[PDB]
Design a protein around this ligand. Structure first.
Ligand SMILES: N[C@@H](CO)Cn1nnc(-c2ccc(Oc3ncc(Cl)cc3F)cc2)n1
Ligand SMILES: [Yb+3]
Ligand SMILES: [Yb+3]
Ligand SMILES: [Yb+3]
Ligand SMILES: [Zn+2]
Length: 607
């Protein structure tokens, strides 16, 4: 059962298609229109059905050209309000009908962020973007907001004519709005059935540049050139992913570089991956995020978790494919370096939550839990560690990649559970069932903490990071003069980031050590968001007051939760910056993404 949805389950009825006709009103901060759902009954004598909604105003529901009765139930916190619709005629099993709902969103819709012109790069036009994963589609339109249902969709979006709309779909033309010549209607078609969390919309002063045979990069004019260069390896990564997963079925693979408040590193919206502008490091070093979103075109978008309790299926397999893409491009020693880095992030998550915390389990129980509050590196890295351990146990990467491809082929266009995955793993590896039976399945899937076995990792690229981190940790005052810029001469940006992560695991360090690190390495000059984030956390945790303005600026000038949440938490934990962190959150709260504002408030204990 999907404990995060209040809608009728897939066993009662299934939405097959959505035809959305809407208009974006920037003056009211509302999306208004009609959602026409083609719904197929799965039961005999079906007379009503329930949809998910959250802060939606319903004007009317039309079936067969006439208004029908509906009722909105009491709100159930983050789940929203159930909408029960009374069907005019009882449906037989497999009968399909179209239900047209006229609705309008709330300006406080948790799916949307409305930006004023001052919040954009161009400063002249406003901007809107959505983020539906996990359960925010219900805050845009009435739907069965569960990944256990997959539907196709078509959309027609009216916007001010100076702006551009894009969606997680193939572009299907644009025309002036026949009802208003100051507006344009943009059309879209998504012919591959998707779960509704993959519905996405952006409206803004967007420009595009072609960077591959099936890829345009989209952003405001000021970021086009930098984005085209940053993401130039996209076609190469798509070709490797097709070799590992099978055909790319989505047609286009475009990228949208969002404003800095985009809450995630990337969102795998089909046909149009959304990415944070914090990837714009200038040297392509953060391109693993693109490899990750590309990989979701198979693991997540084609094979999907049936409920959010099985989210690790989506992320674990995607991290596994992501690391194979980067291993093909940069070598097997690089794949192991990134895999070992991932184990260290899993160590940090388990330490943060606590080793017995229910969110450190691979398969979770989200009954009465807001998915946004559960979100962490555990499903990604505990999921990856299980697959990497099975790869080692079952004969290596070539053999395990055969399983991955067969798994994608088996479950394409379906929504599955951990038991479906395990049953297929046992079926595919029938000649190695004795090896599979040695796995402690109960501990790996259902127990909290670090996994029961740590995989084997090549240490070649990690050794220099560990050695430099240990030199700093073990240094006394009289050793500080031995450090010098030459210590970093043979380290890649990835290795500098790993040196900082290793050191941050032992923070705090003495203030004099951190001051010496800035003296000889000049980490304050580095703009790479991952390195800067770890360096500023190391400074703040080591109680360097000089870092307070730098950390507050990074926390507020961008809104990627991976960076903003720990920076605000570190600033709140440092007595010297505590009041400033709380005051800065209070002043920026109204202008923040709604989910990020909620999570930073919980982290800071500010209501
Ligand atoms: N797909 C990403 C690129 O890797 C981008 N991304 N955007 N939004 C989200 C997201 C995903 C899941 C969430 O809830 C859960 N968290 C953890 C669990 Cl074990 C189950 C859950 F339901 C909440 C949000 N992920
Ligand atoms: Yb067309
Ligand atoms: Yb079986
Ligand atoms: Yb000494
Ligand atoms: Zn992902």
């Amino acid at each position: 059962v999907d404990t995060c949805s209040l809608a009728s389950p897939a066993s009662v009825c299934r939405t097959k298609h959505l035809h959305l006709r809407c208009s974006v009103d920037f003056t009211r901060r509302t999306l208004t229109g009609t959602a026409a759902l083609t719904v197929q009954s799965q039961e005999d004598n079906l007379r009503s059905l329930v949809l998910d909604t959250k802060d939606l105003t319903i004007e009317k529901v039309v079936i067969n050209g006439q208004e029908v009765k509906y009722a909105l139930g009491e709100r159930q916190s983050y789940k929203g309000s159930p909408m029960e619709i009374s069907l005019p005629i009882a449906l037989s099993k497999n009968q399909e009908i179209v239900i047209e709902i006229s609705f309008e969103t709330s300006p406080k819709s948790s799916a949307l962020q409305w930006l004023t012109p001052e919040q954009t790069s161009g400063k002249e036009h406003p901007y809107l973007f959505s983020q539906c994963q996990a359960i925010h589609c219900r805050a845009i339109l009435p739907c069965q907001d569960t990944p256990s249902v997959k539907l196709t969709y078509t959309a027609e979006v009216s916007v001010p004519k100076e702006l551009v709309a894009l969606m997680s779909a193939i572009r299907d033309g644009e025309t002036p709005d026949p009802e208003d010549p100051s507006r344009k209607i943009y059309k879209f078609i998504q012919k591959v059935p998707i779960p509704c969390y993959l519905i996405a919309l952006v409206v803004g002063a967007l420009e595009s540049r072609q960077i591959g045979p099936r890829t345009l990069v989209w952003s405001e004019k000021e970021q086009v050139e930098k984005s085209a260069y940053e993401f130039s390896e996209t076609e190469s990564m798509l070709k490797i992913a097709e070799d590992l997963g099978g055909p790319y079925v989505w047609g286009q693979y475009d990228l949208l570089v969002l404003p800095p408040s985009f809450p995630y590193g990337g969102m795998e919206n089909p046909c149009l991956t959304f990415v944070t502008p914090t990837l714009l490091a200038g040297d392509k070093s953060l391109s693993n995020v693109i490899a990750h979103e590309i990989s979701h075109s198979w693991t997540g978008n084609l094979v999907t978790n049936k409920t959010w309790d099985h989210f690790w299926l989506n992320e674990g397999h995607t991290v596994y494919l992501e690391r194979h893409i980067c291993g093909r491009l940069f070598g097997e020693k690089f794949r192991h370096f990134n895999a070992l880095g991932g184990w260290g992030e899993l160590q940090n998550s388990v330490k943060t939550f606590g080793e017995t915390h229910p969110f450190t389990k691979l398969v979770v129980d989200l009954t009465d839990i807001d998915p946004d509050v559960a979100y962490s590196s555990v499903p990604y890295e505990k999921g990856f560690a299980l697959l990497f351990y099975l790869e080692q146990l079952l004969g290596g990467p070539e053999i395990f990649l055969g399983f991955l491809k067969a798994y994608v082929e088996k479950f394409s266009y379906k929504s599955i559970t951990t038991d479906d995955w395990k049953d297929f793993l046992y079926s595919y590896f029938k000649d190695k069932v004795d090896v599979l039976n040695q796995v402690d399945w109960n501990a790996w899937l259902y127990s909290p903490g670090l996994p029961p076995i740590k995989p084997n990792y090549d240490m070649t690229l990690t050794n220099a990071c560990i050695a430099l981190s240990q030199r700093w940790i073990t240094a006394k005052e009289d050793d500080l003069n031995s450090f010098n810029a030459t210590d970093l001469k043979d380290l890649s940006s990835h290795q500098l980031n790993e040196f900082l992560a290793q050191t941050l695991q032992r923070a705090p360090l003495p203030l004099g050590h951190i001051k010496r690190m800035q003296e000889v390495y000049n980490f304050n000059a580095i703009n790479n968001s991952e390195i800067r984030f770890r360096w500023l956390r190391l400074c703040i945790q080591s109680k360097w007051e000089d870092a307070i303005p730098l950390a507050l600026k990074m926390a507020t000038e961008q809104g990627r939760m991976k960076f903003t949440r720990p920076l605000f938490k570190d600033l709140a934990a440092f007595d010297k910056s505590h009041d400033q962190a709380v005051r800065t959150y209070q002043e920026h709260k109204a202008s923040m993404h709604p989910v990020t504002a909620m999570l930073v408030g919980k982290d800071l204990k500010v209501d």
